[PDB]
Design a protein around this nucleic acid. Structure first.
Ligand SMILES: Nc1ncnc2c1ncn2[C@@H]1O[C@H](CSCC[C@H](N)C(=O)O)[C@@H](O)[C@H]1O
Ligand SMILES: [Zn+2]
Ligand SMILES: [Zn+2]
Ligand SMILES: [Zn+2]
Ligand SMILES: [Zn+2]
Length: 914
DNA sequence: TCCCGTGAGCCTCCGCAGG
DNA sequence: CCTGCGGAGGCTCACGGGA
């Protein structure tokens, strides 16, 4: 695969001279041009594959309504039927109605189980189609039936790409006078073959069930008739029934009655069961803290920045600071349920009025110590208080576990790592004496005195260095036996981290065409994967080939049929894994007006897979980086389609638009934690504060950790086993000019190129970087506060660009103010990360002047080291990379953050323990 | 009436041949 | 060294609807 040049670096930007043997031989310079080489001074050191594409926040507010019910639009054209007679004897007689099985309508016979068409109010709409689930005459002498609605492909995400003859069962059903029926249409159920896995290479039919709100296609439910519903069995009804019984609060144990308030010991809601002494997740507003908090003082008056020293500082119009947790919500409040008591209504217990007497729990950042006092603490560690509060059981977000430190029968770390939602506390807090005594005898569970599953054979395609696999492995559901990675450094790094797996360094296409042609091994004698071998197929196909937003055309769609994603599906089609995971950039879901997404789903469903899609933000799963990825899940017919993970960390609301619009329809994932979460957001401080200080160019690929972990995050990434060596703490050697610039960016949050001094600097190069000169008037931007010009080209005056107007070796890059107006003032370029913020999407090659160019260390005068990047993703420091400093950066930036891959991994685990 | 996004087609120069 | 060539990725400009 052929590499190329970056557009950003100081090398590239330098224009052509005409002094070279090549510059002299160029066609434009009159040369024959047989040379075909660039300027000698324009050989970009950063030369590497820019076979990548950043993703913009293209989605709007999505301030729009959830999808209304499909067939639930009422308005159904009633027909006129002359004669409607029952047939045979009644199946069953109830108190209020009488059920039959057969009915004849205008000489036409129908039966329960038959499928009928119906006519919609609107003429445009395609006929409704449904299954008759019961027949009966009512008290009012009316002859009725119950319809279980189908749903046409075109009504789903699939849209027009659906097979016209395909319908999908849906959770919608209503009652109707038989006379609404138009015709009876035949509908076949295309169930999966006995040998489904092995088949790689004019009637209405259905195979799957469609959840509109979540865009999930799943295998028809297995629920079975009871004694009471045999004569009238409808899946849509039961589904809804079981939903409600789960959704609504009930109660399981009552202790006593008192003062018109029954006291309870055990209540349930939404599938979770709460008992006295259990702990609970609540919203931030559920209760305040009885701790005197002094409202901070209004910031001092800042002396107007010198416009002549900081010309381009005006361009910093008040703007949302990129990588700022000033928007971060607070995490769930936590408390221990002390008492439960419900009200009463109609002489009965009123389950809609359950309240909780709770012991407030302090998060370390909740004490007076504030954040500055919780930097080094376990994110799951709590401080007990005796401060109480009463809460409505309707506000409870979930159960969690909070255990006394010492009380635990294992290691604290063992405990935390043991399962989800596990907190612990060691001391207790006194909001009054602001002291830290230890837990009262009633917080503990009275005890003895003293003080302390088969794995899926996975085939990972476009594996890269194996971020994804790493996360899966962590979840313990996979054993990667084969990996395909066309790029040789990535492939090696993968081998380095997985001695058990066979990495094929080839184009997935030929590798596939090999095993299809009945080949057993590639030219290197590596055993090829055979049907039955692969249980899970995960991959990250690049879509750079056709990453377009406009509509498909003739030969643009051809570029697709030959894409890598289509190869991925040919793998899925051939191997027929139990599971299938495609991960991509967030934009995967809207490329080509979402034909990419629609077409892949269409493919999966064609094969007969259960499948869904969603967008996830990595920050929410334990990483100090903005990273939204699209995700497709698929599951063999016999399986359970997994769900999406539930956010673990609170994260900036702007970085979290997870909803997606396809054909003006709004889809979301099962994700419930919209804003808050169990844990605090991970910061740049949390990420890389323990790292030694390094200079620009630091190439030492082995240095010691001069210090211990200073973060929960770090203790997780460095493990507990003694390891004194710090690998890959190395950053790119930036031009002396660029190094000077980085030195002159302030340290405060919000710093970037716009904060640069317009001064003259003697570099450690001998060359001198000059002042930039403003010799044109900028009609849009006006004047300095002192009437100084702000334009650097004839184009700032509306006139045509003068090429001689360009300026070189200047501290403020001439090109920036030159285009800043039409590009948002390049917010972020030469920008520094901030200790309390987060990485903008980790990049494959750190350029202060690339598009995603906020990449300077918070304090040190340099770009971020390879480790700092590996750290902004989820890589354990143990994880090994391979190649020159550039190769490594690219591998890190390309990879799925293990924390995210793990989160998904665990969701899949739940489908094997089914 | 324009504006935004092209994407077919010309422009560039990377990786490697072979003298 | 050098000479030079394929071929693929980039950048351009005329052209199409989306409203
Ligand atoms: N034609 C091809 N065949 C095999 N691999 C390819 C390929 N084209 C690109 N790739 C590789 O596919 C990878 C996609 S980035 C995905 C990385 C991976 N999911 C992780 O978590 O680490 C890149 O590393 C790229 O080198
Ligand atoms: Zn460059
Ligand atoms: Zn030159
Ligand atoms: Zn029903
Ligand atoms: Zn200009």
């Amino acid at each position: 695969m052929k590499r190329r040049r970056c557009g950003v670096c100081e090398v590239c930007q330098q224009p052509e001279c005409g002094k070279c043997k090549a510059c002299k031989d160029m066609v434009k310079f009159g040369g024959t041009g047989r040379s075909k080489q660039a300027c000698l001074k324009r050989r970009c050191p950063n030369l590497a594959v820019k076979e990548a594409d950043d993703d913009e926040e293209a989605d709007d507010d999505v301030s729009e309504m959830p999808s209304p019910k499909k067939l639930h639009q009422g308005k159904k054209k009633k027909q006129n039927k002359d004669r409607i007679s029952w047939l045979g004897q009644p199946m069953k007689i109830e108190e209020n109605r009488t059920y039959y099985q057969k009915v004849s309508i205008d000489e036409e016979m129908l039966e329960v189980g038959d499928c009928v068409s119906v006519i919609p109010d609107d003429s445009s709409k395609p006929l409704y189609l449904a299954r008759v689930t019961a027949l009966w005459e009512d008290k009012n002498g009316q002859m009725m039936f119950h319809a279980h609605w189908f749903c046409a492909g075109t009504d789903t995400v699939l849209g027009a790409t659906s097979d016209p003859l395909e319908l999908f069962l849906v959770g919608e059903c209503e009652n109707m006078q038989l006379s609404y029926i138009h015709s009876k249409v035949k509908v076949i159920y295309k169930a999966p073959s006995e040998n489904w896995a092995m088949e790689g290479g004019k009637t209405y039919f259905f195979q799957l069930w469609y959840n509109q709100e979540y865009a999930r296609f799943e295998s028809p439910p297995k629920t079975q008739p009871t004694e009471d519903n045999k004569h009238k069995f409808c899946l849509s009804c039961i589904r809804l029934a079981e939903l409600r019984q789960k959704e609504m609060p009930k109660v399981l144990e009552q202790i006593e009655e008192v003062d018109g308030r029954v006291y309870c010991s055990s209540i349930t809601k939404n599938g979770v069961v709460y008992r006295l002494g259990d702990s609970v997740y609540l919203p931030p507003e559920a209760f305040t803290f009885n701790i005197k908090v002094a409202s901070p003082v209004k910031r001092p008056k800042k002396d107007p920045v010198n416009e002549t020293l900081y010309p381009e500082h005006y361009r910093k119009y008040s703007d949302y600071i990129k990588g700022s947790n000033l928007d971060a919500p607070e995490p769930y409040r936590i408390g221990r349920i002390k008492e439960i008591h419900c009200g009463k209504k109609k002489g009965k217990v009123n389950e809609a009025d359950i309240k909780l007497r709770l012991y407030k729990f302090y998060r370390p950042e909740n004490t007076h110590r504030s954040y500055n006092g919780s930097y080094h603490t376990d994110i799951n560690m709590l401080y007990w208080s005796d401060e109480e509060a009463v809460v409505n059981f309707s506000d409870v977000q979930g159960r969690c576990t909070v255990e006394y430190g010492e009380d635990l029968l294992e290691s604290i770390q063992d405990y935390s790592q043991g399962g989800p939602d596990r907190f612990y506390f060691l001391e207790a807090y006194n909001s009054k004496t602001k002291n830290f005594e230890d837990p009262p005898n009633h917080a503990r569970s009275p005890g003895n005195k003293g003080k302390g599953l088969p794995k899926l054979r996975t085939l990972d395609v476009f594996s890269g260095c194996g971020g994804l696999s790493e996360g899966f492995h962590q979840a313990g559901i996979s054993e990667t036996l084969w990996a395909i990675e066309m790029w040789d450094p990535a492939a090696q790094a993968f081998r380095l981290n997985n001695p058990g797996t066979t990495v094929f360094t080839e184009d997935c296409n030929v590798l596939l065409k090999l095993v299809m042609a009945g080949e057993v091994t590639n030219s290197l004698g590596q055993r090829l994967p055979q049907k039955g071998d692969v249980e899970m197929l995960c991959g990250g196909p690049p879509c750079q080939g056709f990453s377009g937003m406009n509509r498909f055309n003739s030969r643009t769609y051809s570029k697709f049929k030959n894409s890598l994603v289509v190869s991925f599906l040919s793998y899925c089609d051939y191997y027929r894994p139990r599971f299938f995971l495609l991960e991509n950039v967030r934009n995967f879901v809207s490329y080509r007006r979402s034909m990419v997404l629609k077409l892949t789903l269409r493919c999966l469903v064609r094969m007969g897979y259960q499948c869904t899609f969603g967008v996830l933000q990595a920050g929410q799963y334990g990483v100090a980086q903005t990273r939204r990825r699209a995700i497709i899940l698929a599951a063999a017919p016999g399986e359970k389609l997994p769900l999406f993970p539930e956010p673990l960390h609170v994260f900036a609301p702007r970085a979290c638009q997870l909803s997606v619009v396809v054909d003006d329809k709004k889809f979301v994932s099962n994700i419930t934690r919209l804003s808050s979460g169990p844990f605090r957001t991970i910061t740049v401080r949390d990420t890389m504060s323990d790292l030694p200080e390094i200079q620009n160019g630091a190439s030492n690929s082995e240095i010691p950790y001069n210090g211990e972990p200073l973060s929960w995050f770090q203790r997780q990434l460095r493990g507990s086993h003694y390891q004194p060596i710090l690998r890959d703490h190395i950053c790119k050697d930036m031009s002396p000019l660029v190094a000077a610039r980085m030195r002159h960016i302030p340290l405060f949050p919000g710093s970037d190129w716009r904060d640069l001094p317009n001064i003259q600097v003697r570099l450690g190069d001998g060359v001198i970087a000059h002042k930039l000169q403003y010799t044109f008037h900028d009609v849009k931007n006006g004047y300095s506060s002192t009437g100084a010009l702000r334009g650097v080209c004839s184009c700032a005056e509306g006139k045509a660009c003068d090429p001689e107007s360009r300026q070189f070796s200047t501290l403020i890059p001439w090109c920036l103010p030159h285009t800043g107006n039409r590009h948002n003032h390049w917010a972020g370029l030469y920008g520094r990360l901030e200790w309390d913020g987060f990485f903008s999407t980790t990049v494959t090659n750190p350029e202060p002047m690339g598009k995603q160019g906020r990449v300077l260390h918070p304090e040190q005068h340099r770009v971020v080291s390879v480790r700092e990047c590996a750290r902004s993703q989820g890589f354990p420091d143990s994880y090994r990379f391979f190649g020159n400093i550039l190769d490594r950066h690219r591998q890190v930036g390309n990879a799925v953050p293990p924390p995210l891959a793990k989160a998904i991994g665990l969701e899949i685990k739940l489908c094997l323990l089914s």
